[PDB]
Ligand binder design. Structure first.
Ligand SMILES: *[C@@H]1O[C@H](CO)[C@@H](O[C@@H]2O[C@H](CO)[C@@H](O)[C@H](O)[C@H]2NC(C)=O)[C@H](O)[C@H]1NC(C)=O
Ligand SMILES: *[C@@H]1O[C@H](CO)[C@@H](O)[C@H](O)[C@H]1NC(C)=O
Length: 177
């Protein structure tokens, strides 16, 4: 199938390295079971806190092996803010502009792993980008996530320790069933 999928991982100080690693584990589980390929599913990975880091761009080779190795090598960046709005803005202003021609009509999906309320202003993405917020732990701002996600309901997960257990299947069921 043809999809553009963005994973957005919060990697602030409030998340911490241990929990960030669990976010990476979650994401690896998803990507491993996705039909990733140059003509099929494309994946981008962002990490964000104060700034946004592009960990794997849409415009590099869309090979599962390459992406997974890069994912394993991602280093927790830390940061004193959770600039979720900035991460979303990057997707609309950069990431989802990569697909061109026929592929421009493919669905755009965003899977975002956050555990804290946004530090900045959140603006809604264009209608052609579907966002599924994954709020992890008790400090996720449910109302904010519901606002970003609409019409998609956010997936609210107990904590980061449990995130890699079942949440990958919830994600795969929404994207790729
Ligand atoms: C999160 O993952 C990173 C990298 O995957 C871990 O960093 C490793 O830490 C061990 C500690 O025994 C070192 O021996 C390695 O050199 C590190 N590897 C890399 C690639 O940096 C880190 O320990 C993990 N952190 C937590 C809190 O689980
Ligand atoms: C917050 O992070 C920014 C960017 O790294 C930095 O300039 C600033 O000094 C930090 N402030 C505090 C109080 O840690």
């Amino acid at each position: 199938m043809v999809l553009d999928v963005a994973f957005v991982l919060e990697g602030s100080d409030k998340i911490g390295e241990a929990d960030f690693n669990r976010s990476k584990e979650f994401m690896e589980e998803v990507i491993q079971r996705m039909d990733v390929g140059q003509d099929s599913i494309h994946v981008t990975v962002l990490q964000y806190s104060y700034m946004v880091t592009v960990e794997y761009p849409f415009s590099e080779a869309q090979s599962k092996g390459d992406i997974l190795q890069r994912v394993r090598e991602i280093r927790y960046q830390g940061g004193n803010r959770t600039n979720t709005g900035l991460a979303l803005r990057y997707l609309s202003d950069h990431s989802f502009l990569v697909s061109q021609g026929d592929r421009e009509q493919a669905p755009n999906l965003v899977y975002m792993v956050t555990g804290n309320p946004a530090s900045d202003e959140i603006k809604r993405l264009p209608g052609d980008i579907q966002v599924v917020p994954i709020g992890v732990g008790p400090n996720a701002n449910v109302q904010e996530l519901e606002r970003i996600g609409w019409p998609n309901a956010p997936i609210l997960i107990q904590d980061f320790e449990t995130l890699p257990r079942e949440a990958p299947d919830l994600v795969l069921q929404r994207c790729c069933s």
